[PDB]
Design a binder for this molecule. Structure first.
Ligand SMILES: CCCCCCCCO[C@@H]1O[C@H](CO)[C@@H](O)[C@H](O)[C@H]1O
Ligand SMILES: CCCCCCCCO[C@@H]1O[C@H](CO)[C@@H](O)[C@H](O)[C@H]1O
Ligand SMILES: CCCCCCCCO[C@@H]1O[C@H](CO)[C@@H](O)[C@H](O)[C@H]1O
Ligand SMILES: CCCCCCCCO[C@@H]1O[C@H](CO)[C@@H](O)[C@H](O)[C@H]1O
Ligand SMILES: CCCCCCCCO[C@@H]1O[C@H](CO)[C@@H](O)[C@H](O)[C@H]1O
Ligand SMILES: CC(C)C[C@H](N)C(=O)O
Ligand SMILES: [Cl-]
Ligand code: NA
Ligand code: NA
Length: 509
């Protein structure tokens, strides 16, 4: 089996797994929509009660499976719980990353396309004072790129440039993955992560220099870091916070599990897992939190900045920020640096959510790496046509896989590892070879608190939010639901073929 070559390479690869579009695009919007500082308390609590403990659990499961030649959940769940239902539950650990990859790589390609256009100066020219006259051109720029519907039909018409850039983006992902764990992902991470940190710090510094009649960057920081205990009683803020913690730490996506399956059986995962999680949180709350919101608040003030965040998931990052930058000397190049930052952030993450399908094809169907990467790329490329052409398909996938699915799967993997496999065997497995030990209090959090927390959250989700999503949506959501259910059936069939192959192999040995 492949292994990470160095400790630093492993840490930077896992940090790159985590530090993505989630830190720079998703976090600011989630925080802004939910009262800034009012979001942060639940967010910190969720990190401590869900993020940290689940990170350790996923590292442990991955390392445990890898020692036996398995990096994905169909096989790993079965190793933990020898029951056919384990294998079926395990399909989610392939299905989630695949469905998320389908839309995530497309959004990642937008950042490459924008980076290129900002670099070469093919960007809107706002008329030099009224905000709308400054934002509108950038709104139109994004809408023309992805082809937002201008009429009634729920159909997208991406530009030719966007489509070609998606092809290039797929090619770049493949070129890293096809080189494997140590020569591909690890090597790339040693270059991308420092570059990413440098760009982000530079952008924070530039943003902190912003001052207008409407405010300063510091007003943005105060908004985000001022506690509001009157929201702690709102289930919505908790659901938001926990969802962001899952997405941001790559938890419940089977991706941490697969990366950890390349860690040697003896190697520490306690300090390593904690460091990766901690690096992600610094990049999220310090870097991600200090770019978009402070820029927006400085130029528009808090109320408007909040209204912008609520407008869409992409307004703040693809429209508002570049518009703000355009009003400053060298602002187009600053826009380039921003999109280049997002691209590297996305790229180090998308390789992580494609690796689970690759590992499954290698481990369970015995494909060569080359064929496993190419088939994985073909499935993602093909499927992405749904997200590229059908309005709001992206939103549906992000909900079922990227939102509900990961919380469900996080709870599932915890129950399988800490309840069925056995809490004490699980604890031993986590701490084995640890440079540090997990604090004793975390045994009780993992066994009792975390699962209760998640169960309650999932119930509130199903009761107070999913009814609307099932009944108040346009009929075209069933196109996406049909397709991703078919993907689940296809993956279950592959797991069935893998057990048949194992049966035929064992009969020959
Ligand atoms: C069922 C269809 C399977 C894959 C068909 C993909 C067809 C891609 O179509 C392309 O879309 C681009 C972006 O809109 C346009 O720039 C090009 O005109 C067009 O060739
Ligand atoms: C990184 C290299 C990507 C090259 C993609 C080329 C896409 C060609 O796209 C064309 O570009 C023309 C000029 O911009 C436009 O007039 C047309 O709308 C468009 O068809
Ligand atoms: C679900 C994924 C398949 C949808 C993408 C199909 C691509 C359709 O392609 C379209 O064909 C039209 C007429 O031929 C042309 O007007 C456009 O150039 C082109 O975008
Ligand atoms: C997955 C749903 C989105 C698919 C993209 C629809 C692209 C619309 O393209 C349409 O294709 C029709 C059939 O070829 C043609 O009759 C029309 O010329 C054209 O408008
Ligand atoms: C609910 C999540 C709380 C996480 C914070 C744990 C802080 C670590 O707490 C420490 O743990 C050590 C090892 O058990 C003990 O030696 C110390 O008594 C204690 O200070
Ligand atoms: C799906 C995950 C790989 C996403 C990544 N953790 C991010 O924050 O963007
Ligand atoms: Cl374009
Ligand atoms: Na993240
Ligand atoms: Na990343």
């Amino acid at each position: 089996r492949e292994h990470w070559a160095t400790r630093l390479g492993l840490i930077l690869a896992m940090a790159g797994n985590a530090v993505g579009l989630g830190n720079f695009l998703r976090f600011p919007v989630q925080a802004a929509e939910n009262g800034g500082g009012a979001f942060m308390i639940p967010y910190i609590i969720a990190f401590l009660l869900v993020g940290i403990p689940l990170m350790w659990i996923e590292w442990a499961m991955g390392r445990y499976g890898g020692a036996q030649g398995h990096g994905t959940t169909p096989a790993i769940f079965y190793l933990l719980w020898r029951n056919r239902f384990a294998k079926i539950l395990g399909v989610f650990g392939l299905w989630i990353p695949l469905v998320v990859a389908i839309y995530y790589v497309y959004i990642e390609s937008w950042t490459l396309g924008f980076a290129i256009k900002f670099l070469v100066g093919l960007v809107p020219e706002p008329p030099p004072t009224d905000p709308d006259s400054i934002l509108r051109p950038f709104k139109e720029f994004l809408y023309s790129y992805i082809g937002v519907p201008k009429g009634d039909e729920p159909i997208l018409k991406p530009s030719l440039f966007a489509y070609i850039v998606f092809l290039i983006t797929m090619f770049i992902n493949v070129s890293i993955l096809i080189r494997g764990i140590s020569k591909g992902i690890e090597r790339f991470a040693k270059i991308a992560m420092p570059t990413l940190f440098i760009l982000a710090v530079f952008l924070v510094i530039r943003v902190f220099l912003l001052e207008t009649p409407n405010g300063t960057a510091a007003d943005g920081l105060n908004f985000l870091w001022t506690p509001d205990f009157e929201k702690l009683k709102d289930p919505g803020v908790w659901i938001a916070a926990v969802g962001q913690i899952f997405f941001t730490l790559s938890l419940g996506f089977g991706a941490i599990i697969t990366y950890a399956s390349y860690v040697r059986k003896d190697q520490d995962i306690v300090l390593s897992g904690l460091t990766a999680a901690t690096l992600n949180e610094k990049a999220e709350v310090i870097l991600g939190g200090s770019i978009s919101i402070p820029a927006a608040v400085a130029f528009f003030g808090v109320a408007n900045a909040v209204a912008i965040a609520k407008a869409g998931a992409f307004n703040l990052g693809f429209i508002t920020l570049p518009a703000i930058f355009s009003q400053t000397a060298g602002g187009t190049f600053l826009g380039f640096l921003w999109f280049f930052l997002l691209f590297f952030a996305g790229l180090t993450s998308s390789i992580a959510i494609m690796q689970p399908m690759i590992a499954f094809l290698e481990d369970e169907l015995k494909l060569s790496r080359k064929h496993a990467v190419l088939w994985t790329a073909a499935i993602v490329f093909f499927s992405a046509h749904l997200v590229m052409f059908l309005n709001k398909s992206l939103d549906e996938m992000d909900f079922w896989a990227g939102t509900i699915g990961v919380v469900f799967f996080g709870l599932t993997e915890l129950i399988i590892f800490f309840w069925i496999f056995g809490a004490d065997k699980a604890w031993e497995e986590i701490n084995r070879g640890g440079i540090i030990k997990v604090p004793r209090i975390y045994y009780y959090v993992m066994r009792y608190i975390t699962p209760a927390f998640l169960a309650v959250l999932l119930v509130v989700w199903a009761r107070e939010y999913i009814p609307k999503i099932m009944e108040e949506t346009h009929w075209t959501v069933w196109i996406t639901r049909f397709y991703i259910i078919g993907l689940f059936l296809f993956l279950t069939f592959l797991v069935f073929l893998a057990e048949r192959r194992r049966n035929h192999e064992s009969a020959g040995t």
